[PDB]
Design an enzyme around this catalytic site. Structure first.
Site, PDB file in Angstrom:
ATOM      1  N   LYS C  34      32.506 -24.268 -38.119  1.00  0.00           N
ATOM      2  CA  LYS C  34      31.167 -23.683 -38.008  1.00  0.00           C
ATOM      3  C   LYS C  34      30.131 -24.658 -38.509  1.00  0.00           C
ATOM      4  O   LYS C  34      29.789 -24.690 -39.680  1.00  0.00           O
ATOM      5  CB  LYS C  34      31.045 -22.368 -38.760  1.00  0.00           C
ATOM      6  CG  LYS C  34      29.770 -21.619 -38.415  1.00  0.00           C
ATOM      7  CD  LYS C  34      29.601 -20.390 -39.284  1.00  0.00           C
ATOM      8  CE  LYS C  34      28.291 -19.653 -39.009  1.00  0.00           C
ATOM      9  NZ  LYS C  34      27.116 -20.389 -39.546  1.00  0.00           N
ATOM     10  N   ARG C  48      31.158 -24.191 -42.730  1.00  0.00           N
ATOM     11  CA  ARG C  48      32.536 -23.849 -43.084  1.00  0.00           C
ATOM     12  C   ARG C  48      33.518 -24.064 -41.923  1.00  0.00           C
ATOM     13  O   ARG C  48      33.132 -24.142 -40.749  1.00  0.00           O
ATOM     14  CB  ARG C  48      32.635 -22.386 -43.544  1.00  0.00           C
ATOM     15  CG  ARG C  48      32.120 -21.380 -42.519  1.00  0.00           C
ATOM     16  CD  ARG C  48      32.475 -19.949 -42.865  1.00  0.00           C
ATOM     17  NE  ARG C  48      31.389 -19.212 -43.512  1.00  0.00           N
ATOM     18  CZ  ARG C  48      30.417 -18.532 -42.889  1.00  0.00           C
ATOM     19  NH1 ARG C  48      30.347 -18.494 -41.558  1.00  0.00           N
ATOM     20  NH2 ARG C  48      29.500 -17.874 -43.613  1.00  0.00           N
ATOM     21  N   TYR C  56      35.055 -20.294 -31.316  1.00  0.00           N
ATOM     22  CA  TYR C  56      33.839 -19.876 -30.649  1.00  0.00           C
ATOM     23  C   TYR C  56      34.097 -19.792 -29.135  1.00  0.00           C
ATOM     24  O   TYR C  56      34.690 -20.695 -28.551  1.00  0.00           O
ATOM     25  CB  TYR C  56      32.688 -20.826 -30.987  1.00  0.00           C
ATOM     26  CG  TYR C  56      31.982 -20.444 -32.263  1.00  0.00           C
ATOM     27  CD1 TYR C  56      32.469 -20.833 -33.513  1.00  0.00           C
ATOM     28  CD2 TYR C  56      30.821 -19.666 -32.220  1.00  0.00           C
ATOM     29  CE1 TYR C  56      31.813 -20.463 -34.684  1.00  0.00           C
ATOM     30  CE2 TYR C  56      30.157 -19.292 -33.382  1.00  0.00           C
ATOM     31  CZ  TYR C  56      30.663 -19.686 -34.603  1.00  0.00           C
ATOM     32  OH  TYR C  56      29.979 -19.297 -35.722  1.00  0.00           O
ATOM     33  N   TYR C  60      27.365 -22.674 -28.805  1.00  0.00           N
ATOM     34  CA  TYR C  60      26.517 -21.841 -29.636  1.00  0.00           C
ATOM     35  C   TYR C  60      25.465 -22.703 -30.340  1.00  0.00           C
ATOM     36  O   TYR C  60      25.709 -23.868 -30.689  1.00  0.00           O
ATOM     37  CB  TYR C  60      27.404 -21.136 -30.637  1.00  0.00           C
ATOM     38  CG  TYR C  60      26.702 -20.171 -31.550  1.00  0.00           C
ATOM     39  CD1 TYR C  60      26.514 -18.841 -31.192  1.00  0.00           C
ATOM     40  CD2 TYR C  60      26.254 -20.582 -32.801  1.00  0.00           C
ATOM     41  CE1 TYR C  60      25.885 -17.953 -32.056  1.00  0.00           C
ATOM     42  CE2 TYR C  60      25.623 -19.702 -33.665  1.00  0.00           C
ATOM     43  CZ  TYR C  60      25.446 -18.396 -33.295  1.00  0.00           C
ATOM     44  OH  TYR C  60      24.815 -17.565 -34.176  1.00  0.00           O
ATOM     45  N   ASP C  70      14.936 -13.206 -40.935  1.00  0.00           N
ATOM     46  CA  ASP C  70      15.829 -13.962 -41.855  1.00  0.00           C
ATOM     47  C   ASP C  70      15.418 -15.406 -42.257  1.00  0.00           C
ATOM     48  O   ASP C  70      16.154 -16.060 -42.962  1.00  0.00           O
ATOM     49  CB  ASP C  70      17.300 -13.919 -41.360  1.00  0.00           C
ATOM     50  CG  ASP C  70      17.550 -14.667 -40.029  1.00  0.00           C
ATOM     51  OD1 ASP C  70      16.610 -15.180 -39.411  1.00  0.00           O
ATOM     52  OD2 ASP C  70      18.716 -14.734 -39.575  1.00  0.00           O
ATOM     53  N   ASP C  75      19.274 -17.537 -32.690  1.00  0.00           N
ATOM     54  CA  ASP C  75      20.551 -18.079 -32.237  1.00  0.00           C
ATOM     55  C   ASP C  75      20.869 -17.706 -30.800  1.00  0.00           C
ATOM     56  O   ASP C  75      20.435 -16.676 -30.317  1.00  0.00           O
ATOM     57  CB  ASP C  75      21.691 -17.560 -33.120  1.00  0.00           C
ATOM     58  CG  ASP C  75      21.710 -18.192 -34.506  1.00  0.00           C
ATOM     59  OD1 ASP C  75      21.437 -19.415 -34.627  1.00  0.00           O
ATOM     60  OD2 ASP C  75      22.030 -17.457 -35.472  1.00  0.00           O
ATOM     61  N   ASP C 107      20.704  -9.043 -37.118  1.00  0.00           N
ATOM     62  CA  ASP C 107      20.811 -10.450 -36.664  1.00  0.00           C
ATOM     63  C   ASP C 107      21.106 -10.564 -35.181  1.00  0.00           C
ATOM     64  O   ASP C 107      22.120 -11.115 -34.776  1.00  0.00           O
ATOM     65  CB  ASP C 107      21.837 -11.257 -37.482  1.00  0.00           C
ATOM     66  CG  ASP C 107      21.631 -12.792 -37.366  1.00  0.00           C
ATOM     67  OD1 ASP C 107      20.490 -13.310 -37.529  1.00  0.00           O
ATOM     68  OD2 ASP C 107      22.635 -13.492 -37.147  1.00  0.00           O
ATOM     69  N   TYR C 144      34.938 -12.593 -36.469  1.00  0.00           N
ATOM     70  CA  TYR C 144      34.929 -13.992 -36.983  1.00  0.00           C
ATOM     71  C   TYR C 144      34.733 -14.169 -38.480  1.00  0.00           C
ATOM     72  O   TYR C 144      35.228 -15.145 -39.033  1.00  0.00           O
ATOM     73  CB  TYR C 144      33.997 -14.938 -36.193  1.00  0.00           C
ATOM     74  CG  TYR C 144      32.502 -14.944 -36.497  1.00  0.00           C
ATOM     75  CD1 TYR C 144      31.754 -13.775 -36.501  1.00  0.00           C
ATOM     76  CD2 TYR C 144      31.817 -16.146 -36.693  1.00  0.00           C
ATOM     77  CE1 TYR C 144      30.380 -13.793 -36.728  1.00  0.00           C
ATOM     78  CE2 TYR C 144      30.441 -16.176 -36.920  1.00  0.00           C
ATOM     79  CZ  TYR C 144      29.722 -14.997 -36.932  1.00  0.00           C
ATOM     80  OH  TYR C 144      28.359 -15.011 -37.155  1.00  0.00           O
TER      81      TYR C 144
END
Lengths: 180, 180, 180, 181, 181, 181
Positions: C34, C48, C56, C60, C70, C75, C107, C144
């Site tokens: 990630k 991480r 994934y 992304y 946030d 994203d 999110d 995930y």
């Protein structure tokens, strides 16, 4: 203490140029993704995924501080043992010029070898390569944009001396036109 | 609103240093390509393709804002589940120091684990690793430059405390000498 | 002659926005790593390695010059034939919004296709996709972060119009709050 | 026909000993020392290599051959692409690599794929770049070092000598198939 | 010999039940659920996995074993490198993973490659990092979820218990080969 | 059972001719032209491709089929994942691709994996994106060009026509197995 900046403008072409030059890789060997360098940001962008089931036959990229009649840097195909990442740069020796017409417009490109690959560094002429390797390369450029209805004619490759003239001229042209 | 800049100089070593530090990856696990960071531009360059049929045993890179007697940052080998890309950075805990002499010159390197890998993050000493893993690593450095006629001696690994001293000292040295 | 700089701030969202926008890829299709963008340096960091044996499902990343409640950019998940490298950018069309609650906090993320992939570029609604592809995606986000004890609820996907509102609003919000 | 045990039931080929079929045990870039199981004819992981090294080319053996070490004659195969374990291909010999594996002679063949349009026109190891040879030499010198096994490798010999060694190993295989009766 | 159906014609090995040969159906990191076809002994794509998940390690089965589910005993094999479908390798058991696959018991073996110089010295699942276990547990819990099949996974049990389960499955396989007469 | 020669000893399957087993010779993205050896039933490198091209999907053949060219009926198989050479899978036909390979008719089947949860619900080539078809068409048009072999490819025909061609090739295979007596 140092710059941190744009690969076209801020990467020296290198002290060995035009014979041996730095070269920024846009596309890896085996890639179906056509990355290119974003002129404005200096980031790597996806220009496109390729329209045919073809892959780049070698690492591909451009020479910093060059400019051609198309307002783009001079492109290079770099033969070497390993695939290299987009956005990295390497040292490459010119071994030939690959003359092309891309949709009725001149777009000659350099064929070269990585000067720090201990196998490929000792090549100096494309004539030294296996004739199939040329036939494959020539084909790739003929075929890669076919499914976009873009015609690309590829002529016989010209020698190192000729390639070096093109690089030299594109260095000169960058220095002339980039100021304004 | 933010800088956008040079990984050696502009990436903080991190608030956990010297025990846990940021670390810029130059070379991926399994790579035959020896990338390194260009000090001037902060780009990644191909220094060379390796002369033997060997590959890097783990992700490899350097610690920003460090400096050694060789005028280079301090290098790190980073153990973790996954391969990581050149030019990325990560958080790593030191678990040992790998003392070396590279062509008659001292070149100690850090052995470490990624602090955000949920498997590897709980290691604290290289003694905790399987002895083969050390024998493999030690061998890699002995062997990787052999075909360039460069001799590299590798001694027994020293503990975390010792590694931390080296990192600490290289931080200090960066801050002393980088100004001028 | 050009900037060379930070992908969040210095990459235009693009003239087609909000319908078609630039999008900086953080994580490749199939990656267990990630990556995320370091807000301060604009480098890519390893946030991480993932705690489950999951990968994934598509490329992304985030949309430059966006901001959400946030304090992060918006994203995107980008469907396309090929995996793309962290740190590259591409052009993407929104085809839906994937509403989520990540540890009790909203999110929402965009689902999109690459506008320069000749297969995927002609999609306009996620309803046009195979229902399994949605079920897979939805699952990925549910699953995930499970091994980190982080609960993530994913609701039914909302249409293109809704996604476009979110992008538009995050553009506006970036321009409002980024100055100070 | 029925399924084939590759060592025994795969023909060496019409062009032998110069051009021969060849079974691939190990892919270019692999750290897994696969080999073909003598008894089952399946592919086995003999071991994972002890050093951080990889096979510089596709590696395997010539079927219906035999050497004094009781194994078939081994081949290294130069070609554009990596190839799967268990597959066979057509290969021309272009040299032989003399080695000593812990006091025992264990010569191997260096070859090219005959159906690979780039590599098929090579006929001598001297036609290859000298570094390619330096790298291969070193691979065999170094790959077993962490098992505490010494492997010495001498100067590569021409294709005429390779062809002899191949022929001689076809004879031994045959000589053994006779001793079955 | 002739070509081998791997389930039947590959020996479990001299060191069984502690150390056994093991046929790999699925590579580390694969999303393809390969399995070995009972009838042909070829490798089949049973399915592509329904979630965006991958096998955390090389996966397969022990030959000449049988369980109440009519399939051979399954194994997960920890080692430095990914391995091809269809290959076999030598593996030590270091634990057993009890599971319930839709009400049916379907215990699997957790193991290491015995010829891998790093992993060969492990003998208990407790010697592995706890996260490794957490991840494996979750994989089996989650990989069939998008097929609407529940899989429960309980605490892993020691190698003594694993060896018993292996032995018991060799007995069942044998008991079945007798019922052929 | 014993080990299987895949062409002959692998059943075409219960759902034939609509849904059939299918042996994979070549992986998606491969430049290696693997094919299955007629005599041994092993996988052979027929050649490395002459252009810088790759197979757009997993490619292979339907067992117990035969065409006028003396080879089994070829299939291209669309699915989420690349698959190994030598494996078989279940595939539904969704169209047929008429071609002329140097004056000789050499029609192939376009198909999806029936066990792939994404791709299994496709039933007609018209359900696929038009570019997918444009790319496949071009692949066959272009992949043999550097061997100086012309390949013409005409408009793809529906699954009803594909099923006929499959049936007809099962008949020919059978007709040949009779001519063995």
């Amino acid at each position: 203490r140092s710059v941190a900046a744009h690969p076209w403008h801020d990467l020296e072409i290198g002290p060995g140029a035009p014979n041996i030059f730095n070269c920024v890789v846009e596309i890896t060997k085996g890639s179906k993704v056509k990355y290119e360098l974003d002129k404005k940001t200096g980031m790597i962008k996806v220009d496109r995924i390729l329209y045919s089931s073809v892959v780049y036959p070698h690492n591909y990229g451009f020479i910093p501080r060059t400019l051609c009649e198309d307002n783009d840097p001079l492109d290079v195909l770099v033969l070497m043992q390993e695939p290299v990442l987009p956005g990295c740069f390497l040292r490459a020796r010119a071994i030939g010029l690959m003359p092309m017409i891309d949709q009725g417009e001149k777009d000659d490109k350099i064929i070269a070898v990585c000067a720090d690959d201990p196998e490929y560094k000792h090549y100096t002429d494309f004539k030294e390569l296996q004739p199939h390797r040329l036939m494959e390369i020539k084909r790739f450029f003929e075929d890669y944009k076919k499914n976009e209805n873009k015609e690309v004619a590829v002529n016989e490759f010209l020698p190192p001396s000729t390639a070096v003239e093109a690089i030299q001229h594109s260095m000169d042209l960058y220095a002339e036109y980039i100021l304004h």
